[PDB]
Paper text:
The formyl peptide receptor 1 ([name]) is primarily responsible for detection of short peptides bearing N-formylated methionine (fMet) that are characteristic of protein synthesis in bacteria and mitochondria. As a result, [name] is critical to phagocyte migration and activation in bacterial infection, tissue injury and inflammation. Here we report cryo-EM structures of human [name]-Gi protein complex bound to S. aureus-derived peptide fMet-Ile-Phe-Leu (fMIFL) and [name]-derived peptide fMet-Leu-Phe ([name]). Both structures of [name] adopt an active conformation and exhibit a binding pocket containing the R2015.38XXXR2055.42 (RGIIR) motif for formyl group interaction and receptor activation.
Since most of these studies were conducted using the tripeptide [name], we further obtained the cryo-EM structure of the [name]-bound [name]-Gi-[name] complex. In this structure, the [name] uses the same binding pocket as fMIFL and its N-formyl oxygen forms hydrogen bond with R2015.38 while the carbonyl oxygen of M1 forms hydrogen bond with R2055.42. Like fMIFL, the L2 of [name] is in a hydrophobic environment formed by F812.60, V1053.32, and F2917.43. The C-terminal Phe (F3) of [name] forms a hydrophobic interaction with F1023.29, T2656.59, and I268ECL3. Based on our cryo-EM structure of [name], these two positively charged residues do not directly contact [name] but form charge interactions with Phe3 of [name]. The same hydrogen bond networks were also observed in the binding of the tripeptide [name] to [name]. Indeed, the D106A and R201A/R205A mutants failed to respond to fMIFL stimulation with Gαi activation as shown in cAMP inhibition assays. It is interesting to note that [name]-bound receptor is more susceptible to single substitutions at R2015.38 or R2055.42 which abrogated the [name]-induced response. Our results show differences between a tripeptide ([name]) and a tetrapeptide (fMIFL) in their reliance on hydrogen bond formation with R2015.38 and R2055.42, such that single Ala substitution of these arginines only caused a right shift of the fMIFL dose-response curves but abolished the functions of [name]-bound mutant receptors. In FPR2, the amino acids at these positions are S842.63 and M852.64, and the loss of the positive charges is attributable to the much lower affinity of [name] to FPR2 (Kd = 105 nM) compared with [name] (Kd = 1.6 nM).
Residue numbers in the entry:
A (entry chain A): 5 to 55, 179 to 229, 239 to 354
B (entry chain B): 5 to 340
C (entry chain S): 2 to 121, 136 to 247
D (entry chain G): 9 to 62
E (entry chain R): 22 to 316
Write the structure that this text describes.
Amino acid sequence: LSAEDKAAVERSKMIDRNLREDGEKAAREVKLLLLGAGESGKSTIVKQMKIVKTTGIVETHFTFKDLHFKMFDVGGQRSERKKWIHCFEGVTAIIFCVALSDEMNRMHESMKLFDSICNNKWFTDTSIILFLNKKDLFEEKIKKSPLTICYPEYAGSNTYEEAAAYIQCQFEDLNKRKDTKEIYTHFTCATDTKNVQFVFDAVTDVIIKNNLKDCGLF
Amino acid sequence: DQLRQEAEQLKNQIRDARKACADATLSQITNNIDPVGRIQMRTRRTLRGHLAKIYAMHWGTDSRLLVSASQDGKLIIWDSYTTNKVHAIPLRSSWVMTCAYAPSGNYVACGGLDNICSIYNLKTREGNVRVSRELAGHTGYLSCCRFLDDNQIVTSSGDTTCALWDIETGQQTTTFTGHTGDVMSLSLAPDTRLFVSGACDASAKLWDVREGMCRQTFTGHESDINAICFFPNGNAFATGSDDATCRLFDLRADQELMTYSHDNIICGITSVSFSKSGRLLLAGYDDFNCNVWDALKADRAGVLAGHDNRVSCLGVTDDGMAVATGSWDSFLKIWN
Amino acid sequence: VQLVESGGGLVQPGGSRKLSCSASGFAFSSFGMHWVRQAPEKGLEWVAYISSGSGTIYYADTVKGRFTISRDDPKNTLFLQMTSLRSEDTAMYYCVRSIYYYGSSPFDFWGQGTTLTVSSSDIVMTQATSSVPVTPGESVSISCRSSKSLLHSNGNTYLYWFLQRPGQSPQLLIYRMSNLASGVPDRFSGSGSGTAFTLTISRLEAEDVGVYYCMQHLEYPLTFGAGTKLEL
Amino acid sequence: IAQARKLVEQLKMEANIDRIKVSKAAADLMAYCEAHAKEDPLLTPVPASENPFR
Amino acid sequence: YLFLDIITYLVFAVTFVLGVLGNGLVIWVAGFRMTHTVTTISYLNLAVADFCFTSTLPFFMVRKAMGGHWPFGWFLCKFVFTIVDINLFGSVFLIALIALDRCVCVLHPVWTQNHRTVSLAKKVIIGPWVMALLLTLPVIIRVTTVPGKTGTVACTFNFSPWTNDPKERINVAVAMLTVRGIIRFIIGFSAPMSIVAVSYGLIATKIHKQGLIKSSRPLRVLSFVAAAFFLCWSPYQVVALIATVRIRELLQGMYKEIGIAVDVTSALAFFNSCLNPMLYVFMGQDFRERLIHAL
Ligand SMILES: CC(C)CCC[C@@H](C)[C@H]1CC[C@H]2[C@@H]3CC=C4C[C@@H](O)CC[C@]4(C)[C@H]3CC[C@]12C
Ligand SMILES: CC(C)CCC[C@@H](C)[C@H]1CC[C@H]2[C@@H]3CC=C4C[C@@H](O)CC[C@]4(C)[C@H]3CC[C@]12C
C-alpha cells in the first residue's frame, strides 16, 4: 500500500481543488480581442471604456452591468500573425476599429486586413464588432474632397449619410459566411455610453446564441 | 550591385561544393539493415489537471518529474510514477508558449507572448515557489528557452534574434543575429557547446555558444520550420517543417541526408524528438496523430493515436523508458 | 524562520492547560505540524500530528482521548489543549514542522521548547550503546536497530538521524538513511540496510558533541528510542 | 548599403568549411545506432518486472 | 380485448430493448468519452434513471404473462417495486429540471455567465433523487407478497397486515390508495407538465421576439420534446385518476375495463423512457459525431 505517500496524495488533492476553484473563477470573464490599423482610434476606444514591462500584450479589465469584460490589445507585437493568432481561438468577441477619415489609400489596406481576419480558419463562429470612429471630420473631408478617389466605381451623391452607408456596406460585404458569423456595425464619436452599451448588447446576443448552440437547440 | 552578384557567385560555389562532396545517399548504405516492425505503445498513465490548451513540456533530468505549461496561467510539476502534483505555479501572464526545467532541478523557466522570460526557484526555505528573475530585452514573443548550467540561459524570440543571458546579473551576455523571419525552436548540444535553431524562413542555423557567431546554415525546406532536435550523437539533427516533411541534416557533411514524408499526411509538424539510441524518430503531427519513424530507413514504424486535438508538445526521458505527449485537449499521455 | 511556542509552567494533577505555537517566516498553511515532548533526563517521544488542511489527525496511544490538536491558518498559530494532567506528563515540549512531497525533507526545523511541571504492536528501536568517549580529529560510528524491516516496496527506507547538542533543540542530520540535509557539513554520512543502520562521522570538532537519536517514519505512532551520547 | 558586406563576409567565412563524404556520415550513424541498440527500452520492450510504469 | 394483450406485449418488448441499448449508449458516451459539463451531468443522470427503470422491465413482462402469479421471492418483490417507483419519479423530475435549466439559460444570459458552475450543478442535482426516495418510501414500507387463497401470490400493497376483517381492511386500503392517487396527479403530472410547458413557451416567445432564427430547428425540437412527453404521460395519469375515483368499487371487482386500460396505458407511459435518449442527447449533432468517431 502506502506509508508516507498518503500525505503526498493529500497534497495533490488540495492542489486539484485549488486549480478547479481558480479555473471556475477565471472562466466567468468575457474575452474581447481588439484589432485595428495604425492610429485608428484604438487608444480613444481603450480610454473611453469604464476601466516598461510587458510591451507585447496590454490587458484591460473593466466591468459593466455585472458583466466582467477583459480586452486584449496586441497591436504592439510586430511579428507574423499566422504564428501566434491561434492563441486567441476561444475569444468571445473581436472588436475592430476603422478610421473613417479618408489618406494614402488607408481604406484599401484596412479592407485587406479585415478580409484576412474575418475569413481566417480560426475565427469561425466568432462575431465581429466594428467601429467606424473618425466620423467627426468625415463630413469636412467629403465636402472638401470627393470619395471617388478611394472608390472609382462609386456613383452616388456626396452627402454624409449616403457615403457612410456605402462605406459600411463595402466593409460588410467582405464577409464570406453570412450564416455563421454576424458582423455588428457602429458609428462612434466622443460619446461613451453608446459605445459601452453597444458592446454590452452585442456580447449579450452572442452569449445567448452560444448558450443555444450548447444546449442542442441550435 | 556588385556585392549582390558576388554573393550569388559565392552561393553557387557553395552549392557546387556541397554537390561535389556528396556520395550515394543514406538509403544505399542502410538498404540491407534489419527493420523494426509494429512498434506498438499503449498509454500507461494519463495526467489530467489542466483546463485549456497545453503548449510546452520538458522532462526532468532524473526521468521522473516533468513540467507542463497551459494557457490558463499554470505551470504544473507532475510526478510521472504516481500521477501526483508536486507543485502548481500561477503565472503573471497567461499567454505562455514554452517552458524548461533546469538540469539540476532547482529552477524552471517560462516565457510567451509578453516578451519576458520568467525564472522560478523551486527549493526555497519558506516552502513555496518564488520568482527569481524576469529577463526582459526581447522585442518579439519568446518561442523556446533552454538552461545551460543554472546560471546561463539561452532564449529564442520572434524578432529574428536569439539571446544568451547570465541569470545572476540579468542582462544579455550575448546576442545572435542572422535570420530573416521568426525563430521557432532551438536545441542545445549534448555537451552544451554548440546549438542549432530553426527559423520561420525555411532555414536552420548552427551557432557556437562562445564567441557568438553563426557557424553553419542549412536550407532544404519549403515553409516554416516548427521544431528541431539534436541527434544523441551530437553530429546531426532533425527538422520538422510546416508542409508535412521531416528532414535529417548533418553537421560535418553540411547538407541533407534523408527526408520523411508520406502522401497520406498533409498536415504540419509541431514537435520532434529522438530515442536514446537514435533509431526511432518521433513526430507530433497536426492531424491528431503522432507518428514514429524508423530514422535509418524512412519507413514508418508506428502510430500513437489517443488525442482529441492536435499534439503540441512531445518529449522522451533521458534513460529511454517513457514518452510524454501533450495536446490541445488538456491531457498529457505517457506511452511505453 | 521561527516557531516560538509558549503556555507551559506549573500545574496540578487533574487540571488542564493550553499550549500555543506561533510560526513566522514561512508559508505556515502548507506544512504539517507535530508535537514532540521530552521528559527530564530521558529521550524523545512523539505526541501528536495534524496535517495540512486539517484533514488528518493522529495521536499517541498513551495520550489518546486526553489531548486535542488544532491549527489556525490566518493567525498562524498551532494550539494543543491538555486535559486531566497526571504526574507522568511533566516534560518539555517542541513544535515541529514537516512537508511531504516527492523529494522533500520532513522534520527540518524544530522550535525552542517550553517547560511543563506538574506536582505529585508498535515498532521498537534500540541504541544499545549509551555513551562513547572520543577526542577531536578521529572518526566515529553509531549504530541503530529496529524490530522489523524499514525498507518499503517503493525502494526507500524511512530512517531519520537527529542531533541534540547540549542546551539547544534537536536538529535534523539525515533523512531516509542516505540524504544529507541542507546546511549540514559533508563529514556526516549514513548507511545500512534492513534492520541495521550506521551513522559515521569522519572528523570531530567541538560542535559535534551531543546526543544522537534515530527515528522511523514507516508507520504511526513514531518511536524515537534512547540516544547515544558523545563527549570529549 | 551595409548589409551586403556583412552577408558577403558571413558567406566567405562559411566557404572554407572542410567536409567529409556522405558515406562516412552514413557509416557513423549506423555504427552509433548499432552500438547502443541493447540499452534502448523502446526498440526492444523490457519485461514488466523492471518497467516502472505498471 | 385479445388485441390489447399483443399490443402491450410488443410495447413492453420494444421498450425494453430500445431503452436499454439507447441508455447504455448514452451513459457510455456522456460518462467517460466526454468531458463533464452541466448539460452532460443532467443527461447522465436522466440516462441512469431511465436505464435502471427500463432494465427492471422483464419482471413486469413475466408477471403479466403468468396471469397474476408472482413466482419470484418477497425480497425481489420489494426491491423491484422500490427501484421502479424511484426511477420513474427521478426521470420525471429530471425532465422538468432540464426544461427549467434551458429556460433560464436562454432568458437570463448574464446570470448564467456568473453562477452556472459544475459545483452548483452537483449541489443542486441531489434534489430530484431525494424527492423521489422520500415519495417512494411507502413502496419500501407497505409493499409485500401475499397469497390469494387460491394457489397464486400477488406483489401488492398490504396496508393493514394486523387484522383480517374485511371492513376496516377495505376502509384503510381505499383511504391510503386514494391519498396515493392524489399525490400522483399533483406531483408526478401537474408540476412537471406545467414547468415544461411554461419554460418552452417562454423560450419560443423570446426567440420569435428578438429574432435569432437562422432556421426552424429550435422550434421543431421544442415541439417534438413537449409533444412526446405529453402524449406519453397523459392517458395513463387520466385513467389512473379515473380509477382512483371509483377505487372502492374496483376492489369488489366489476370494472375489468379499467383493469385492462390501466395496464395498457401504463405500457404506453413506460414507452417514454425508451423515447427520452433519442429526443434529448442524440438530437445534438456533436454527440452524433462523437458516437460515430468512438465506434
Ligand atoms: C441495474 C441496477 C439495479 C443497478 C445499476 C448500477 C449501475 C448501472 C449504475 C449505478 C451507479 C451508476 C454510476 C454512478 C456514478 C458514476 C460516476 C461517473 O463518473 C461515471 C458514471 C457512473 C460510474 C455511473 C455508471 C452507472 C452506474 C454504475
Ligand atoms: C438507484 C437509486 C436507488 C439510487 C441512485 C444513486 C445514483 C445512481 C445517483 C445518485 C447520486 C448521483 C451522482 C450525483 C453526482 C454526480 C457527480 C458528477 O460528477 C457525475 C454524476 C454523479 C456521479 C451522479 C451519478 C448518479 C448518482 C450516483
